[PDB]
RNA sequence: UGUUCGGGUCGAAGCAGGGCUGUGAAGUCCUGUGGACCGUUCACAAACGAAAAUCCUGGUAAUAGUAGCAGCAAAGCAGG
């Protein structure tokens, strides 16, 4: 069950260095890598709620937000449930 | 091919590498492989000897893990 519950505020400023239309994929990869290194788990262990995917693709694939605030959960079996914090 | 004398499953031809002979074309022997045919005297024949033809046919290098997999319609991400 609950072993590590904390709210994060992932910055996405390095995402804005790739070409314009490839920014959303890079945003997804960046969020996943942030959670991987701040939760100490393998890459596959990380799961993303559809709210995060909705938020990153709100304004097309060229204008991802410059920040995002998530609320992740860690379980003993390994999985991490990241869902969009308010 | 005609003729004389022979060899071979106790291992013929062929192939790889060596020893000796000959100025040389080449001959003969030894070792490994191979599994069925091959020589020699005297003569006679020829669809008879290749390193080259921007030669012919087949096999195979370097170039090289290289060019290309962009240009006219830049399309995908999350969960299951
Ligand atoms: Mg030739």
Cβ neighbors of A42 (< 8 A, separation 6 or more) are A36, A78
CA of A53: nucleotide with nearest C1': B78
**Method by which this entry was solved:** cryo-EM
Distance B78 C1' – A31 CA (angstroms):
13
- Residue A22 CA: distances (Å) to CA of A14, A76, A85: 13, 35, 25
- Which positions of strand B lie within 7 Å of protein CB atoms? 74-80
Which residues get their CB within 7 angstroms of nucleic chain B? A 20-21, 24-25, 28, 32, 46-50, 53, 56-57, 60-62
Tokens of A9: 């505020």
Rg (alpha carbons) of chain A, rounded to whole number: 13
**Which of A73, A74, A59, A72 lies closest to A27 in space, CA to CA?**
A59
């Amino acid at each position: 069950d609950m072993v590590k519950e904390q709210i994060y505020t992932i910055p996405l400023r390095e995402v804005r260095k790739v070409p314009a239309w490839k920014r959303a994929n890079r945003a997804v990869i960046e969020v996943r890598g942030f959670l991987v290194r701040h939760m100490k788990t393998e890459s596959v262990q990380v799961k993303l709620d559809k709210s995060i995917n909705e938020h990153l693709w709100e304004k097309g694939c060229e204008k991802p937000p410059l920040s995002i605030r998530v609320r992740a959960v860690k379980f003993a079996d390994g999985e991490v449930q990241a869902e969009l914090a308010q």
